[PDB]
Design a protein around this ligand. Structure first.
Ligand SMILES: Cc1cc(NCc2ccccc2F)n2ncnc2n1
Ligand SMILES: Cc1cc(NCc2ccccc2F)n2ncnc2n1
Ligand SMILES: Cc1cc(NCc2ccccc2F)n2ncnc2n1
Ligand SMILES: Cc1cc(NCc2ccccc2F)n2ncnc2n1
Lengths: 131, 131
């Protein structure tokens, strides 16, 4: 079955959350209802503010700010590596984190800046395994 | 661990999709970045168009329409039961479907109208078990 008896009264659908995320990523790929452009070292990434806020403490802070919530363009710190940001943006929309020896430092520094502690801790654990 | 080696190269975060959905529901509860009001028999429900489109074929069709995508208010068919709609809206944001003997017919008819076939099939299976 696609469902089960949850701990509470309700039946719960096993694949619902992952199917929603897959569909949000399909909207992103098709540029449907994207409402922000994230600029990183002149690279541009179109996304949905709600997805960014649901994954990142920095984006949650920006988009809950009365002044900043209505910005259509957000420029990140020029020190931020676009590949590191791209890997984290894909992670937000897919649950898959493409960590490689060549990108782990950029991913970790970007996750720190974006306040994604779970990703930072994961990078730290992978780095610790190599030393 | 909060992660595993996916079938592909990437590490995957087990709870990421459900955590995103939980956070989207927290935004909904706080009325943060909600961009549409769904009106059902004069009852109003604030939501995020992207979440609605990711769950419902009717909302996908409406919000991908060049004319309708920019509507802030969507009126549903007056035949639609507000409780049935509320139960399905909560399901979209939580993966939990509060089916009860007293609401199953309204939920099924609403899921048919909203084009949520997985929910319709589930209602059909529960009804079949009672006969
Ligand atoms: C605790 C919480 C956090 C959060 N977003 C920011 C965020 C998400 C994931 C990981 C780290 C992080 F800082 N949101 N968004 C809506 N409601 C929330 N409640
Ligand atoms: C390779 C690498 C290392 C590093 N360390 C900090 N950062 N920080 C940002 N981008 C980076 N890229
Ligand atoms: C196949 C698909 C469907 C869909 N939304 C509509 C929808 C969602 C869940 C269940 C039924 C349904 F009709 N979206 N949304 C973005 N990309 C999509 N791709
Ligand atoms: C109880 C009930 C039954 C039913 N059958 C169709 N619908 N349809 C809409 N709302 C309904 N409510």
């Amino acid at each position: 079955n696609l469902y089960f008896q949850g701990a509470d009264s309700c039946i719960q659908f096993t694949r619902h959350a992952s199917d929603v995320l897959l569909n949000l990523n399909r909207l992103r790929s098709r540029d449907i209802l994207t409402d922000v452009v994230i600029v990183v070292s002149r690279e541009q990434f179109r996304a949905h503010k709600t997805v960014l806020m649901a994954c990142s403490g920095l984006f949650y802070s920006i988009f809950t700010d009365q002044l900043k919530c209505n910005l259509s363009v957000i420029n990140l710190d020029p020190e931020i590596n676009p590949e590191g940001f791209c890997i984290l943006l894909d992670f937000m929309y897919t649950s898959r984190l493409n960590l490689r020896e060549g990108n782990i430092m950029a991913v970790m520094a970007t996750a720190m800046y974006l306040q994604m502690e779970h990703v930072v801790d994961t990078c730290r654990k992978f780095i610790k395994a190599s030393e």
